[PDB]
Ligand binder design. Structure first.
Ligand SMILES: Nc1nc2c(ncn2[C@@H]2O[C@H](COP(=O)(O)OP(=O)(O)O)[C@@H](OP(=O)(O)OP(=O)(O)O)[C@H]2O)c(=O)[nH]1
Ligand SMILES: Nc1nc2c(ncn2[C@@H]2O[C@H](COP(=O)(O)OP(=O)(O)O)[C@@H](OP(=O)(O)OP(=O)(O)O)[C@H]2O)c(=O)[nH]1
Ligand SMILES: Nc1nc2c(ncn2[C@@H]2O[C@H](COP(=O)(O)OP(=O)(O)O)[C@@H](OP(=O)(O)OP(=O)(O)O)[C@H]2O)c(=O)[nH]1
Ligand SMILES: Nc1nc2c(ncn2[C@@H]2O[C@H](COP(=O)(O)OP(=O)(O)O)[C@@H](OP(=O)(O)OP(=O)(O)O)[C@H]2O)c(=O)[nH]1
Ligand SMILES: Nc1ncnc2c1ncn2[C@@H]1O[C@H](COP(=O)(O)OP(=O)(O)OP(=O)(O)O)[C@@H](O)[C@H]1O
Ligand SMILES: Nc1ncnc2c1ncn2[C@@H]1O[C@H](COP(=O)(O)OP(=O)(O)OP(=O)(O)O)[C@@H](O)[C@H]1O
Ligand SMILES: Nc1ncnc2c1ncn2[C@@H]1O[C@H](COP(=O)(O)OP(=O)(O)OP(=O)(O)O)[C@@H](O)[C@H]1O
Ligand SMILES: Nc1ncnc2c1ncn2[C@@H]1O[C@H](COP(=O)(O)OP(=O)(O)OP(=O)(O)O)[C@@H](O)[C@H]1O
Ligand SMILES: [Mg+2]
Ligand SMILES: [Mg+2]
Ligand SMILES: [Mg+2]
Ligand SMILES: [Mg+2]
Ligand SMILES: [Mg+2]
Ligand SMILES: [Mg+2]
Ligand SMILES: [Mg+2]
Lengths: 430, 428, 428, 427
């Protein structure tokens, strides 16, 4: 009973429910892996948002360890954001081919700061030519009080227990078990340091068996850039640091200038580039025509959010995802749902509506791994209420998603769009 | 104005109303009987849910006395659940062919514990062959202080006033009246005890004239089982104890393994087997194809309930009942509405939408007959706010249904689906 | 304008404030040490209460490390409470003269369980005569997958780096630094194991420089007992495990039977015994006459708490402390304030009113170190809202007390009673 | 019915009321002048607190124009605080002997920045020796777009209408009127600039006839310093910039080290030094013995405030003022009531209890003249926006005049004797 100008009805997550369907698969047996972009895969379909209150290196590391991925925020210098990337890539199994080093004339303070930075308990000591001279570890410094003392005075000097480039995990773990050590430098025939294996690599692989990793076995990570000449310089620095994909993050992804920078940034790097944000079919198509490898969907998804109140602009998120998916699914381009979430059950709704993954934002701002210092004022806060470890949040969200997939009969994420049947509900049902 | 992926609108009870229609029948004259399953009938269209806070024997007994039926929960051992079944079946008129007995060397404590267990005021005393030796009753023990004293010392010994196998109610009552006694053992020609009638059988028949009973005149009762190998052992034990139907209770009735166990639980017993839960036409058809004698409908029926919040899964209950009824009515399989209730008027809505009965849940957890212990903390609670006797809840619910039926013109539940006309309403 | 029967006005913490006074001492320079009892001293004047939701070994260890002390609750078996004591006493520097050991035939699973129990990363391996055979540590077991494997197969055998009984801290650390090891077994001339030093002893001494310790350098701990024959057996078992003081915990410390058991318990052990609870001068004097080494003050201290509502019994806590201190100060017996706290500033008020230390209760139940299990239900809770590490609670409380002492001019706790001047305030 | 240790009852403003008394004086006729310290006088008995959200130069100027005084906060460098002092002292009539100047080689941007800084509409242009070359004013720059143009190109050059040092207000005004100009440079016989009069001096004197001023006719101002070697240097820098009194501002005024610095600072300057904070008779006496010229009273005056909750320390403010005044009134040392205010009626209560003036704090943080930036977020904010200070002070002073009329006090000094108190219950 409305004119055509107003015919379309937009739906939010609360407006719809998924129906139970014929199922031969239990929640604990479904596969939750999905694609961030054409060439980036995760083991749970969740990202942490590129917000300065949410994702720096510690959050990105935990997300990837749990099988998702973090998108490092860009509200910091190029050098600081690239450093955040490096910390993620060189977290565990990341020093097999790019180890940290220290010169023997350095102080213990410099060595300990490096150990704290990369969260590891030792540094190979090398000369200017990269020849291995020895190794200084936490135990060598445990009883040292003078931080000005030189590394050479406390390090364990060569000859050390070492391995060859390409040593297998089983063989490297047999040199840490036989010699009662936790570190294994990798050297070439001339004794030049080529890599480093430590017990951390094996401990973290066992504790986090579903970690999302790159082809080199290092934790996956993404990073946000803007749409500007500066964003191009930032993109290059992040690619050099080893980032696995870029997110060109704009409030209006359908702006022609933003689209142009997406194309320019994409053509200037060899890694996947995600573009956003859009909330319509034609906007998603414009991003695809601009060449992005994934799209991010969400413009004014939240009730009485800023763009809605200030500008009257917005799209209910189920409709936004569905409309964008008409273009994205037709092109085979993964779709990230970004905004409007209110329950773990909304994840399955997003996937059945056409999303491949879902980005989590303010929900992860109170988590231990988010940036900011934990402060105490009668209760615990992040300087936002303290929520505890990320792992507890993700376990509940992924547990919920597995329930949805079992109820719908989807053994894989790719089956969700076809097997998920929707019903709309009224405000009485809500 | 939505894409077809989202065309369907689901309706809950609050979304609709029933219209008044042409009527020639008053509320006090309508018939409220309905079917639980193909071969199980009740006198009011209501069940108590298989929740451990709701239905054990006391709840099941009261439900059946009021004309409904209870579904005994399964959060207990097979032997404990079978015992709950036995307590219901042998409540009133249930010992005519399976009496309790005690040996003459038993203590008064053992006899009184048996009386308390079955809520009967005496025990026939027999020897190892079943020969009736006497009877010990509440009055025989009233003034006794030593609980170790042997039954034989206080029992009334044979010869007793007894009845024959097959004695009628009228004849049994006349014997009780004439001899001013409350118990009538039933014996065969050799004096072997075959059954027992007590005044409770007549008192409860008069107090509860609409009791739901089996073909032998014993209170009806159901019991829940899971979907697993253990559920098959449980089913056999419950059937042996005299349960009238089984409810294969699963959260996702459309799961292939759950459906398979339904066909394995149904084919292994001779009593009716209900399956659930489903909320779609295709789900109901899958239950029917698996061979169940009734279906239970309800998946995420409640606003912001657990499956909805955790998993985003759910179906508004009016739509769920209607869609499932499209399959159930064509197959002649009764449909139990399980969940989403908020008012007594919702019962009539469920029936007009296609349900045959409605299962009551947390509503009843506060009733006197629920398993919890009544405790006092400034006010009364169950250890859940105390609601009082089940009878008060059912009286209001059944009274409401009779009003609906009078307004719609339905003289029977079976007329509700055709005569009940709906209108949707807005939030205003 | 009231009868003499009602002349006395009782004051709670909120009724009074402390005045600023002449001061030559800054908050960061005051001394916060005080006495729990005649012969037990702490570095901050705070105890954790003997409640089963608050203080087991983990809470007691953290309290002592921060300079206070925990009182282990008694809602568990005698052997379990004594085990809790043992865990505290042998936390750090507690195995120098009483080490844990394991047979060479024991499994890695058994060795790891012992390491987890005492929060130590290795076990000396000995024979039945206590002769040292080797040592098995976390690194020896790090890559092992079979938990049934023998410890002798993965352990480092003698000869080990060892020290003499009585080795100094500097000398032991020198051995750990030169041999790049974390353990130093202590042996006699015949190679019998006499003690164990590990890097934990040095790490924890550096991290917690204000730890409250006994004469042997082990963390202080108290434990609660009741007032009954069983409490006498419990007291002995706790004393044997190395507890530093006992708290006879009753709600009516002025009961003649409770007073009698305090004397009996006091006379049956050699360690300090605290008695409570009381809230009057005559009650404190009765505890003192019974022979206790400290008193605990608090009977119905909180507005609309249970004893007040149920029984109308209670004493505002400032009055309770002051009245009890009239007896306790004359006898030189320390006074523990137990209850009624609402602000960190109430600590200074209690001390100025006559308390020597203050017991903290439900405040701490939400701390990480409390016995409950940390669970996540949208937010973090203990099974009570999760508050985080004890250290921040104590840091805020001790910081506030230091502010109080600076304002009043008290350089030491005992100066609080004389230099702390009070003013009463109205509800405005 | 309590032990002697707890005998004393402390009273706050809400605990008491003043009685009406015999009165022959109406509210509009009472005199509201009082003393900040032995040698500093105000026309309304109110100060603005030395909080960085309350009093910088703009707040201090408005307070002084209304007859009170501001105490400039010290959460800034010595040179930044001294600059704040200079801005107040050289607000109106403050350049008669210390004018701003600019060189002919300066730009219009630099000239306009100076005019904006001192809120003056022109700058005398001088050479390096101070010889007057001309004057550049707002009207000279009104139509100038280039902000890099040199002042010499747009200034009015000498010969200007000038006056001599010591010219009277009446004579200076006649020159401004006769020549239809707003500026009057003051020069010596050699044409060296010695001072400056502008129309602002007369406009502001007429708009603010009760402006609290010093002996030279410049707006009064105070400034806070700490209790430390750095505060001794800060005190000298503030006294060189022309501050009229210092406030040695500590959370614990009865601390021996704080008292020692009060004595050291007092003896190192020639201006009045106020010390605080205290809340007892012995604390006030210790401040007096240290040599201060006024005391500030208030330690944990507010219900469930920080010092009360964290440390259990505090004194209800009526008791604090009364007890401190027992020492203050005996020595003739003025007493500043600092904290606990909740109504305009509490001012009269403070004065009747023994205070000479009352310091206003967070109340004023929302006023236009407070340091914060006025921002619009659906509504106006700085805390909520309160508008001009004048509106707050008008209501507060109006209330005090009502109190004095009801009590019969023609002067502030009569409040202590004529103000009769009654305590009230929570009912
Ligand atoms: N010097 C120094 N070392 C740090 C610091 N933080 C962590 N480490 C060390 O790096 C390794 C990894 O620490 P984790 O805390 O578990 O790493 P994670 O953040 O990536 O999860 C550990 O050594 P490990 O040898 O791999 O394991 P383990 O021997 O401690 O068991 C740890 O001792 C620090 O701030 N300074
Ligand atoms: N020894 C013993 N008897 C119990 C106990 N509980 C109930 N009874 C008796 O069993 C019969 C049923 O009691 P009800 O209370 O009416 O049974 P109900 O729970 O099934 O409704 C009564 O005897 P009746 O002869 O059938 O009726 P009446 O003579 O009491 O009127 C009653 O006295 C018990 O705990 N111990
Ligand atoms: N096998 C085993 N060891 C445990 C366990 N819990 C703690 N530990 C070990 O005991 C020592 C104390 O751990 P903490 O966590 O600091 O002790 P705490 O509870 O008393 O504070 C550490 O070894 P350390 O050598 O003293 O310190 P470090 O080598 O880790 O630096 C730690 O590795 C456990 O559950 N199982
Ligand atoms: N160039 C410039 N001038 C400013 C600025 N702010 C104030 N003025 C001028 O200085 C004099 C004081 O302005 P006020 O607003 O009254 O000063 P106030 O802050 O102390 O109250 C006025 O000139 P007047 O000649 O004394 O008065 P009138 O001719 O404006 O009436 C005014 O035009 C500024 O930011 N830049
Ligand atoms: N590959 C190696 N060859 C020789 N010595 C080594 C080697 N790796 C480590 N060390 C030395 O062995 C000793 C133990 O160091 P390791 O790396 O095994 O543990 P750590 O991380 O310092 O110990 P902890 O886990 O107790 O903090 C140190 O002196 C270290 O320098
Ligand atoms: N069939 C019977 N023949 C003979 N005596 C009987 C018979 N049934 C019961 N009695 C005896 O009659 C007396 C009354 O018992 P009855 O069963 O009538 O009532 P009750 O339930 O014990 O009493 P109450 O209802 O007062 O609690 C008892 O001594 C009982 O032993
Ligand atoms: N006193 C000792 N003499 C000889 N070997 C020792 C001695 N103490 C420990 N070891 C051996 O040294 C190796 C290192 O053990 P240590 O006690 O130093 O700690 P760890 O178990 O390696 O701890 P971490 O978890 O910190 O790596 C182990 O093989 C242990 O058996
Ligand atoms: N003492 C003076 N002698 C000569 N000319 C002067 C003198 N003072 C100002 N002028 C010049 O007179 C003109 C008017 O300036 P004046 O100071 O009177 O007002 P203004 O503050 O610049 O203007 P307005 O009040 O309109 O903003 C300007 O050219 C100014 O240079
Ligand atoms: Mg290590
Ligand atoms: Mg270690
Ligand atoms: Mg009877
Ligand atoms: Mg160790
Ligand atoms: Mg280690
Ligand atoms: Mg002008
Ligand atoms: Mg003008």
């Amino acid at each position: 009973g409305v004119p055509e100008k107003f015919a379309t009805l937009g739906l939010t997550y609360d407006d719809v429910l998924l129906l139970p369907g014929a199922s031969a698969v239990l929640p604990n047996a479904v596969d939750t892996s999905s694609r961030i972009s054409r060439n980036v895969r995760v083991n749970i379909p969740l990202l942490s948002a590129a917000m300065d209150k949410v994702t720096e290196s510690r959050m990105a590391i935990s997300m990837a360890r749990q099988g998702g991925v973090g998108v490092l925020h860009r509200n910091l210098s190029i050098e600081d954001q690239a450093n955040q990337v490096d910390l993620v890539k060189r977290s565990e199994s990341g020093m097999v081919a790019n180890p940290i080093t220290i010169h023997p004339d350095a102080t213990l303070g410099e060595a300990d700061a490096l150990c704290a930075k990369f969260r590891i308990s030792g540094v190979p000591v090398t000369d200017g030519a990269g020849k291995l001279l020895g190794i200084v570890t936490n135990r060598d410094m445990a009883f040292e009080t003078d931080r000005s003392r030189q590394v050479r005075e406390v390090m364990t000097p060569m000859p050390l227990v070492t391995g060859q480039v390409g040593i297998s995990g089983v063989d490297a773990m047999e040199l840490l078990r036989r010699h009662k050590i936790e570190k294994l430098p990798l050297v070439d025939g001339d004794g030049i340091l080529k890599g480093l294996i430590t017990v951390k690599d094996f401990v973290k692989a066992e504790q986090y068996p579903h970690a999302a990793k790159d082809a080199k076995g290092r934790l996956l990570v993404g990073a946000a850039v803007g749409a500007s000449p500066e964003a191009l310089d930032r993109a290059q620095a992040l690619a050099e640091a080893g980032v696995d994909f870029l997110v060109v993050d704009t409030s209006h992804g359908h702006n022609s200038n933003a689209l142009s920078w997406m194309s320019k940034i994409k053509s200037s790097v060899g890694i996947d580039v995600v573009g956003g944000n859009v909330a319509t079919r034609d906007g998603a198509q414009a991003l695809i025509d601009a060449g992005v490898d994934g799209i991010k969907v969400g413009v004014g998804p939240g009730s009485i959010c800023t763009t809605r109140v200030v500008a009257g602009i917005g799209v209910p998120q189920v409709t936004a995802i569905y409309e964008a998916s008409l273009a994205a699914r037709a092109a085979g381009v993964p779709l990230i749902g970004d905004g409007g979430l209110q329950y773990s059950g909304d994840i399955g709704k997003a996937l059945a509506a056409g999303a491949d993954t879902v980005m989590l934002g303010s929900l992860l701002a109170g988590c231990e791994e988010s940036p900011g210092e934990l402060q105490f004022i009668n209760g615990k806060q992040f300087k936002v209420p303290y929520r505890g470890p990320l792992a507890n949040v993700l376990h509940q969200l992924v547990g919920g998603l597995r329930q949805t997939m079992g109820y719908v009969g989807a053994a894989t994420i790719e089956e969700m769009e076809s097997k998920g049947r929707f019903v709309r509900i009224t405000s009485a049902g809500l």
